[PDB]
Ligand binder design. Structure first.
Ligand SMILES: [K+]
Ligand SMILES: [Mg+2]
Ligand SMILES: [Mg+2]
Ligand SMILES: [Mg+2]
Ligand SMILES: [Mg+2]
Ligand SMILES: [Mg+2]
Ligand SMILES: [Mg+2]
Ligand SMILES: [Mg+2]
Ligand SMILES: [Mg+2]
Ligand SMILES: [Mg+2]
Ligand SMILES: [Mg+2]
Ligand SMILES: [Mg+2]
Ligand SMILES: [Mg+2]
Ligand SMILES: [Mg+2]
Ligand SMILES: [Mg+2]
Ligand SMILES: [Mg+2]
Ligand SMILES: [Mg+2]
Ligand SMILES: [Mg+2]
Ligand SMILES: [Mg+2]
Ligand SMILES: [Mg+2]
Ligand SMILES: [Mg+2]
Ligand SMILES: [Mg+2]
Ligand SMILES: [Mg+2]
Ligand SMILES: [Mg+2]
Ligand SMILES: [Mg+2]
Ligand SMILES: [Mg+2]
Lengths: 53, 23, 208, 303
RNA sequence: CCCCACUAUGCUUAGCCCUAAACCUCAACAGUUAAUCAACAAAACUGCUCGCCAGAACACUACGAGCCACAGCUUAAAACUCAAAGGACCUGGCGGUGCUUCAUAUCCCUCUAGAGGAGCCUGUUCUGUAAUCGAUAAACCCCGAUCAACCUCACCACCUCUUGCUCAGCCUAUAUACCGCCAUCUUCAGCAAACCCUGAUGAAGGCUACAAAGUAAGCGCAAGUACCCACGUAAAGACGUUAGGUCAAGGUGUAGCCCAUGAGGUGGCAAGAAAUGGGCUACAUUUUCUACCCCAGAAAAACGAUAGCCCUUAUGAAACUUAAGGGUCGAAGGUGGAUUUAGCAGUAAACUGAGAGUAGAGUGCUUAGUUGAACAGGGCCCUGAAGCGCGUACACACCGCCCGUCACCCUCCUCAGAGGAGACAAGUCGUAACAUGGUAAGUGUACUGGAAAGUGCACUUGGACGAACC
């Protein structure tokens, strides 16, 4: 009947898991930040030459 | 290329078939 | 903002500054030494070092304020606390010693526990998958939970059902009911939980 | 050109002598400060922009540094890196690289000059990325155990980068005190805090609990003394004018904190500053703007 | 289009039918890689042979002929019509366009106060009158007006004057001729002359920092400046977009009147059937009245008009029609539907003054001050932004282009009257094609349907699938 008093354990688990989800979002963002930018820099350094020179 | 010639031919053919059906 | 980005919000806490130097980790000592050369925002006129200061009650007063009437909001808050304490004292005196041990008389504790009971664990948010928004259930962060509890309390007190009943008495009665896990505010929390459970099937619509 | 600048310098010397004669001062000991004062007097300009005002300065300060012709009569440029178009910048880079090679073979006081400063030194126009490249190279030089022989060079590109306790005065009766002032919004407060007292605070000649019947304002008055654990140790006489009750309370709080700084230790003063008890709240009412309801409120948009 | 059922049909046998975007749109054979080559595509050619082509549309059509074909297939014209049609690209606009990153009072949720409900004030539309004009999507609507009783006034009715206040005059048309002053993106950062280079010396394009063709004066941004700091707010904000606003600030080109479209006098309208925008007051108990400017006492079904009616006063020559005060009345309403506005801090909200203008006059505008918050964290359907791309039949640039039916007329062809084509040419019903055109498009064929067309089967890319792993 939605009485949290006797659902305390499950509610605490849910809250802790949500906090862990936010923490995981933060850590994943910082970890994401080879990167496409660096790889494009490398490819620019060594470009494909489909023509003559 | 576009398909404007094909569309003109398609309309011609459709109208011809419709007329043949009619008459 | 008249404060440049280099300005930091002040840290008003006597114990923090009176902490012994030997008890400071290297990072804490670095933080103090850095703050020694940082501009600090002037202390706002709301919070002080007073030991009786309560951030939760201050925020409740601010939320209850209407049109910059801080004096009136504080008056209502103190009247509510006094009414709660008087009612608890009356119950304590009229009650037998067996239950006097459990009867609570601290209005601040009563208020904190009432808000905590009113806090909703899960809310409903519009989440969009494919171009349609649905009221998907979602956990509510701590700030949102506290804010929702306080706002529900204030709105329920402000309802027009209670006529000729002053806000002090209304809020004291509602706070006591919430402390005892009853009343319209807890009913609203349970309604939110019931709606979230009813829409439980849409949880996957969340992407975060 | 050089001849033009020389003629300008001669003109400036003659005019400086003339101005000294005009003002009656000694031509010999007439300095640039004296020239500026004399010109400001003789040609009073209220133009806000100082640069737009009359100026009689040395031609060196007036005219911009003109880059001299970079080749001789035969046409041959002077610097072997001339054709780079950035000969000075690339010469500097080349020298830094040579120093770095020699270093590699053998083995809160200043900052890095801005791109504008580097351009001024090199009499050349640089780019953000060129400046960043040069700064990275200089940082590598700094990290690479640069000795005196290298530090003497490096320092050419380095640019150098607490509450003011009031004096303690004494009244006629020999009691020590400190006087301070503080402004909040439109409220200005002058507060005198005595070294010894029973905690009495008399504002405008009235007891504080009467002047500030509002608990919030009394709490604001309490906040400084309570913070430094000096409640009941100091007497205060405050005079506050302007603003409302809350502005007056804040101004008095700032003035009291500043005055009490003279009686608390330096560590306590720094702690108060960190708690924000000595900062002048710059938040003041924002002017209303034409065509809108208030400072930020806009008129109801009518699509 | 999406879901379900089911038939012809897809399958076997024997015959027919003989068509495909039957396309690898690139003929067979032999040879070359040398001095390139309109564009794109799948590099440029040489020799030899056959087939085919000679502006578009009429026309995968009519007639003739052949055929197991009987609404068919192959071969295939002419008349009338037009100055074009077409192929490939470049720039831009656009995409119910892709990926990524975003919007910081901003696009959605989230926070606060509102509008949308009531009365009143005011503007506008409509109606009304003899009775202005202009703004009129964002970027109009307390806007020109920091203001209409007469005047203002440019309007209407009547009357009067004619070298007229003016070496005349006109508030007469043209803001789609303008100067002047501005709205708008702009809550942008780019506009750029003069050169250089690339593209075979086409329209056009010009970047990679471990750098690969750009250099750039000038304008803008920025900086500097005012207010209270170096923050914030002002101010500033180029080149251009909307033939955006103003001929009614004034001036002015063109055009128009001159016994009047000029000038003067008296009087007069400036209202509400009704709708709608903005604001003010409220619906109250965080409230109402009083004292005080915050330690009170009463009120509480009363709260609630700044409206209505009467009186008085202020200004004025003129006040039922302006303002203030008083009296009287105590009305609608009981926190407002989808929708929608503003706000990132001394801000929103609430409250109190002052000023411009007037003889007087706004709930309007400008401005000073006081009390003074809540959220500020997640995301990309709709709005939009930037970068990198993709598509393009649009170029008046999607408020585009455009297809077909039905009726609107002239020319030609076939024809017992009727059909077909083309043009002239404005409509009706759809929105089929062009963007992933909102179901990708199209070929062959079959059925079906006002109509563009839908669907089945196979085929084409003359679509894409975002091009390391995720
Ligand atoms: K409303
Ligand atoms: Mg046709
Ligand atoms: Mg095939
Ligand atoms: Mg065919
Ligand atoms: Mg045929
Ligand atoms: Mg035949
Ligand atoms: Mg907004
Ligand atoms: Mg209304
Ligand atoms: Mg009008
Ligand atoms: Mg008009
Ligand atoms: Mg008149
Ligand atoms: Mg009039
Ligand atoms: Mg006229
Ligand atoms: Mg215009
Ligand atoms: Mg501005
Ligand atoms: Mg600027
Ligand atoms: Mg126009
Ligand atoms: Mg116009
Ligand atoms: Mg006339
Ligand atoms: Mg009245
Ligand atoms: Mg009179
Ligand atoms: Mg009443
Ligand atoms: Mg369509
Ligand atoms: Mg389609
Ligand atoms: Mg198909
Ligand atoms: Mg069908």
């Amino acid at each position: 009947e939605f009485r949290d008093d006797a659902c305390r354990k499950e509610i605490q688990g849910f809250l802790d898991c949500a906090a862990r989800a936010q923490e995981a979002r933060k850590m994943r963002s910082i970890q994401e930040t080879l990167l496409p930018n660096k790889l494009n820099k490398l490819l620019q350094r060594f470009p494909n030459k489909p023509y003559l020179s | 290329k576009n398909v404007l010639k094909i569309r003109r031919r398609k309309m011609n053919h459709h109208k011809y078939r419709k007329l043949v059906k009619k008459t | 903002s008249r404060y440049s980005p280099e300005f930091k919000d002040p840290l008003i806490d006597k114990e923090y500054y009176r902490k012994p130097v030997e008890e400071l980790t290297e990072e804490e000592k670095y933080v103090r030494e850095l703050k020694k050369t940082q501009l600090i925002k002037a202390a706002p006129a709301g919070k002080t070092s007073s030991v009786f200061e309560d951030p939760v009650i201050s925020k409740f007063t601010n939320m209850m304020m209407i049109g910059g009437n801080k004096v009136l909001a504080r008056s209502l808050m103190i009247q509510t606390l006094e009414a709660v304490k008087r009612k608890q004292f009356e119950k304590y005196h009229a009650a037998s010693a067996e239950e006097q041990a459990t009867i609570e008389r601290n209005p601040y504790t009563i208020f904190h526990q009432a808000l905590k009971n009113c806090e909703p664990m899960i809310g409903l948010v519009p989440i969009l998958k494919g171009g349609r928004f649905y009221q998907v259930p979602v956990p509510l962060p701590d700030r949102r939970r506290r804010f929702l509890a306080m706002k529900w309390m204030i709105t329920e007190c402000r309802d027009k059902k209670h006529q000729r009943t002053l806000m002090p008495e209304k809020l004291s009665h509602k706070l006591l009911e919430a402390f005892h896990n009853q009343g319209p505010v807890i009913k609203r929390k349970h309604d939110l939980h019931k709606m979230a459970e009813a829409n439980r099937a849409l949880a996957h619509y969340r992407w975060w | 050109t050089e001849d033009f600048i020389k003629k300008q310098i001669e003109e400036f010397n003659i005019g400086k002598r003339h101005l000294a004669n005009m003002m009656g001062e000694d031509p010999e000991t007439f300095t640039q400060e004296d020239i500026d004062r004399a010109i400001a007097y003789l040609f009073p300009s209220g133009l806000f922009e100082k640069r737009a005002r009359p100026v009689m300065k040395h031609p060196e300060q007036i005219f911009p540094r003109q880059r001299a012709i970079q080749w001789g009569e035969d046409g041959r440029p002077f610097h072997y890196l001339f054709y780079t178009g950035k000969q000075s910048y690339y010469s500097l880079m080349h020298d830094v690289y040579g120093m770095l090679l020699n270093l590699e073979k053998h083995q809160i006081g200043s900052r890095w000059l801005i791109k504008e400063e580097l351009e001024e030194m090199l009499v050349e126009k640089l780019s953000d990325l060129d400046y960043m490249q040069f700064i990275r190279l200089l940082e590598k030089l700094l990290t690479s155990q640069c000795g005196a022989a290298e530090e003497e060079f490096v320092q050419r590109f380095r640019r150098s980068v607490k509450q003011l306790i009031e004096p303690v005065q004494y009244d006629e009766q020999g009691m020590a005190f400190s006087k301070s002032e503080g402004k909040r919004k439109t409220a200005k407060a002058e507060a005198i805090v005595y070294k010894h007292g029973s905690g009495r605070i008399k504002v405008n000649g009235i007891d504080y609990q009467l002047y500030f019947p509002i608990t919030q304002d009394r709490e604001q008055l309490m906040f400084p003394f309570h913070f430094v654990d000096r409640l009941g140790k100091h007497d205060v006489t405050c005079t506050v004018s302007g603003g409302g009750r809350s502005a007056q309370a804040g101004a008095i709080r700032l003035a009291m904190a500043k005055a009490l700084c003279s009686f608390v230790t330096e560590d306590e003063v720094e702690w108060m500053r960190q708690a924000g008890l000595l900062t002048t709240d710059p938040r003041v009412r924002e002017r209303k703007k034409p065509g809108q309801e208030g400072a930020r409120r806009k008129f109801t948009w009518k699509k």
